Symmetry: C4
Subunit: 199 residues, 4 copies
């Protein structure tokens, strides 16, 4: 409950910033919405608290909390639990609101994403609507190829996501090369399903 306190003072700081910068009504709305969904009335130093513990405990926990994510994700579900653990360790949580552009075709990409809860759409130059849902991932292709985002990804609903930064994606994939081919294979299918080809 110290945290249901922090929450309301932080959102008081937020409101101030908005005032000083004179942001428009529907933009203050947008930001207020996101806050509720992002923090849901509570704020605490997740990271700090895990830092006080050792690895074994840190790994039991992350494994427990991400239990449904691992289980509904063919790639994780069917993998070396240790790879899973490595991966889960480096995920950072994120929230997107409906109509947000998580990824823009063209852009340079430094992150990939795991869908916890939500629906998201894959768009190219008239590739129709391709939907990804819980236990799906996107944003891998860019990272592998070191070239540019091969399509745009828009949030169709509120999207609860876990993201993995490029350095982290590569550190882990250094340790588990077998798991690179796993990514690569689904990526060639994805590029094959839309009609693209890459070096």
């Amino acid at each position: 409950d110290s945290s249901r306190r922090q929450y309301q003072e932080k959102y008081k700081q937020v409101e101030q910033y908005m005032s000083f910068h004179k942001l428009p009504a529907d933009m203050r709305q947008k930001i207020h919405d996101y806050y509720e969904h992002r923090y849901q009335g509570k704020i605490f130093d997740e990271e700090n608290i895990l830092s006080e513990l050792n690895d074994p405990l840190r790994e039991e926990i992350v494994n427990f909390n991400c239990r449904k994510l691992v289980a509904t994700m063919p790639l994780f579900a069917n993998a070396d639990p240790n790879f899973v653990t490595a991966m889960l360790s480096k995920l950072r949580f994120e929230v997107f609101q409906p109509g947000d552009y998580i990824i823009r075709e063209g852009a340079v990409g430094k992150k990939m994403y795991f869908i916890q809860h939500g629906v998201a759409g894959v768009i190219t130059k008239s590739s129709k609507e391709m939907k990804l849902t819980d236990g799906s991932y996107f944003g891998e292709i860019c990272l592998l190829t070191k070239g540019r985002r091969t399509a745009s990804v828009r949030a169709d609903t509120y999207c609860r996501l876990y993201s993995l930064s490029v350095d982290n994606f590569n550190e882990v994939l250094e340790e588990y090369p077998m798991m690179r081919r796993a990514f690569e294979t689904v990526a060639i299918d994805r590029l094959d399903r839309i009609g693209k080809k890459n070096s």
Copy 2:
């Protein structure tokens, strides 16, 4: 209003430091002036507050706040909004007082500047007074050439500025090479207007 509180305690800390170091009257004046102009009676953790939000929101906002800057700047105004966004993300705000030397001819340079509000003068070995004003930029040439500051830049008024550090200038220019030629071209004109030439 928590921030109109912080302000006055921070400037109380400042006054103490000055006392312990026995700084002269007109130097304490100079520092007091700058404080008022730099913070204008208020202090808050801009960065912190943007960190709690996601990218879409962070980008809407920075775009809104820098609206006049983008619009009065041929280079930004006539560019890929995404390049603009990339750029705006990495700008840090700065204040200079009249007669300050923002850049010294000769020096190694690690920053460039965008004039928000103010007037500034370009000086070389008898190149007269060349003035840059709102929606102008300077300090690019050094960064491009990786050699030394090609002229001095003095603040003729109070100058409100946004600066961009070298690593950031290059990260963005990696992503938008077309925009490098834009810089390069105005730079050759600038060196041509004063009579200099560089590898």
Copy 3:
């Protein structure tokens, strides 16, 4: 005694996190146990406090506190006190609970360990039980060879340990090459005692 205060509020933060994440009874138990053993009712900013001091003092102290460790460790005990000092400077303290897997055969390794108090067991594919105790070290082999953990290490009791990260192991071993051969030699004996061979 400010620290016997901090302790109880921090463990209050811990309890909250557990609640919000709905961790199971024996896992909250496990975490509560570790806390007592790890901090033993008290928390203070060891690092912070050493940072205020200079090197000479920082070195006297670390030498004093690690007095029994150095003295019961053939490798340290019989070495250049300065090497010892360098080493001791970079050790970070850690606690493991009985049945924890400190190191997993196969894994990539970024740390090595010094046993202060406790017993630990070395396991391979039917290599029986090999026990290491106070003033022993393990996890060196991986670091030297830059290849993978050559066996698993499990905590048989509560284990009080000091660990040394790879960068630190190498920085020091750059300065004291003679001391590399010391490590290398015991490592070849260790690999010889279990029947393994490495490039």
Copy 4:
């Protein structure tokens, strides 16, 4: 005066640490002495406070505070004021007590020192007593040659010092190569005065 408060609570934290670690009487004495001399009853966040200001102001100030240091130091006194400014920017303050070993012959070196107030002695294998005093510097030779400390430096009195870390020494010397030869020359004389020779 907020700072004459902080001081006494910090030294209360220090006392606690000592108790928990059961340090000997003359070692608690040694640490208490140093505290008085190092902070002299007051503590404040020098760095923090300079961070709020811009460069021009930051440079005026550091120049003012180090006025006697620059003026009694042939190397600084007779140099490009800008080089001086660059240098002064990166100095960190340090205190040593009588009989401390600031530098040990043999060791790898990552710092050099400027004597503000104090006396210090240069020792080799029977090179007698060579004393350096206010406006002198030492620890340069190592940094230049990238090899090892060429002699030991002991504090003969309480020594008030400013130190410059290797990266910083090189960054500045990149910008002012002329000033490298200045260092190099005095270094060859120093090695010539004791009878040593180096690649």
